[PDB]
Symmetry: D2
Subunit: 218 residues, 4 copies
């Protein structure tokens, strides 16, 4: 079926120091909306929680419909053949993050196991000093180099407390076990408008919301 | 005033070999549409005319309105203070193009002088062997690092005769003589949906059309 | 002590398909030389073994001396405080590899656990159609953004059977538990000349050799 | 013949503001050394002169010998067939520089006409606030994608008064009118160790020195 609920185990390290969080959420697969509540399973995060935002669930594209039918993500959930996500994120100050997102399915419930590793963040930079204030709205571009692969790109920017934006070049592959349907492959590029919100009163517990909208035309 | 007509002198070199074209066009600054007819001032181009498409006029953003009023490009034409365009384009096969676009104004008529230099295109690649078939529709992202500068980015792809897409990472600065208005600076990022068409029966004469639409939300 | 011997478990996936190898090697920490024999723990690798070469042991920089004394890698082994390696590799045809290298120490013996994930390799590209013939000799650049971090960069190229090179932009962080010594930090950049050899007659059983030489001057 | 002397006209703009300098120099084509004295033809430069260092004469590789004979640059001067240089430089803070270097020859005298355009330098960044203190020694990598083209790459860093480095990804093509000799093409990659010095007490009058050494092995 289409998803109704999900859980996430997100873990890895930033600048060599481990982190680990767990949480659960819901979403509406007719509209590309999702919500997630997460908490650290040890102490508060030693880095800005905003650095995790694109890995939170964009993190569950099974909630994303396409304009005229199911997204390839949804189709791959429906027969449980699935897909894997691999990403590399290059920040303006030389730091980089790499991630691998993996899923299992139980009816309308998704379980995510997401490994996120970041290195090279300056100790005085906005990530390690908690100066990110929001993730800018984004447009993500998808092309399909072959019938089992989506290449997704965007320029990711955050606002910060001193007014400057903090930039990143984001690249991702989604690799499918079975070919995507012809009606998906025939419409390229596909764009996705992404909006997010994050609330956290401490660096230990987070509430995340997202809305995504696919479009190939205007 | 807003523009009605334009002319272009576009020149430079590809792989060390000079080219030079001139032409004239029109556009509708209420809708972000433009048309241009161009011809080589010597022989046919020795490279795919499609490689010139983003430099043709996106090349005249004075025809681009913003969602709630004039674009910064239009405002800068209205008092003739103007702006300059500088771009760097990195292709997947190692080649790169750099360009500088400059304008003068005479009432509702724009004159463009555009220098485009490309190097490192493989002699057997799709540019030098005329295998590009169309420029994919694009979404361009704008942010404003300061009141006189737009940083524009996108992933640019062409379709080719053998089915594969030909990729490029595009970066641009627009540098304004006078600050952009507060109402521009307050809405970031700004996105632009771009559609183009190119007709050419030989590599010597081209007809180009474009439609651009700014949006900050969906 | 300085290392004499090592073992490696290298695993991950390419284009969504798991691989796993184990092996053992030796090296000379006076000269930056190492040798490794590896065997797949299932069947032959489904991709060119040359794509792993950079992750085999550069993979054990505990064998690398510096010009005037121990490298930071060697010093970090001597007190077992250690370091972690994180890398991101962007190939010319859009594919990318990410990796995490981790070590444990038992006297003069090193154990490596290396996770390498690659995606987006075209099925007809040089990696998936065994076109890579050798890794070019390289010069790696090190700078130290802070006392616990090395940022390593190079342009990585392979020769291929198509008579062209296959290119990659390589970025790496080495993150140390304890600060590097002042004599290390005082000499930047540091360069490393790397030579490798890969012998194999099948894709399940590899023999790798390397020689590295550090230099800050000529 | 091999060069003994040179002159340079270097011009363009930074952040939309024109600059122009002229000067003269000498070098030793047996050793890859050069010296240049430059003066602004208006007032002092409005940006750090260190940002030009890479374009001063690496700027005259006709002074660079190769390990076993003339460099391709020297050979191309000997018959005056020549070469053109095109570069794109991406700085860490989003700014970029593009350049085109052109030469004419009169016996052992070279005349350079170099156009350098930079945009997007933050007004409070290291370039516009004179924080650059030296260009790090570099190793430049050359490969030859075809017999008329050198692709040159390096990671370029400056030290700064903030006690950090200011980074750039440098890419260049050298495009030759006639094919390079077989003895050049047969040895790849070729590396070049570069050292520079800049003396100035004001921003209108610069003294530049460089030493380059080619090597394919260690």
């Amino acid at each position: 079926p289409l998803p109704k609920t999900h859980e996430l185990h997100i873990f890895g390290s930033f600048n060599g120091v481990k982190f680990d969080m767990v949480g659960e959420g819901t979403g509406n697969p007719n509209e590309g909306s999702e919500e997630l509540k997460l908490k650290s399973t040890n102490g508060p995060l030693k880095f800005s929680p905003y650095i995790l935002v694109p890995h939170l669930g964009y993190g569950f594209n099974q909630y994303l419909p396409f304009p005229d039918g199911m997204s390839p993500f949804q189709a791959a959930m429906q027969d449980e053949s699935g897909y894997q996500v691999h990403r590399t994120l290059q920040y303006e100050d030389g730091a980089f993050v790499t991630a691998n997102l993996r899923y299992t399915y139980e009816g309308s419930h998704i379980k995510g196991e997401f490994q996120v590793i970041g290195t090279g963040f300056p100790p005085d930079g906005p990530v390690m000093t908690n100066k990110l204030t929001a993730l800018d709205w984004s447009v993500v571009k998808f092309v399909y180099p072959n019938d089992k692969t989506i290449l997704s790109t965007f320029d990711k920017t955050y606002t910060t407390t001193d007014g400057k934006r903090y930039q990143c070049t984001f690249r991702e592959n989604n690799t499918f076990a079975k070919p995507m349907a012809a009606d998906i492959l025939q419409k390229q590029p596909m764009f996705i408008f992404h909006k997010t919100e994050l609330q956290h009163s401490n660096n230990a517990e987070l509430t995340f919301k997202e809305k995504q909208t696919a479009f190939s035309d205007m």
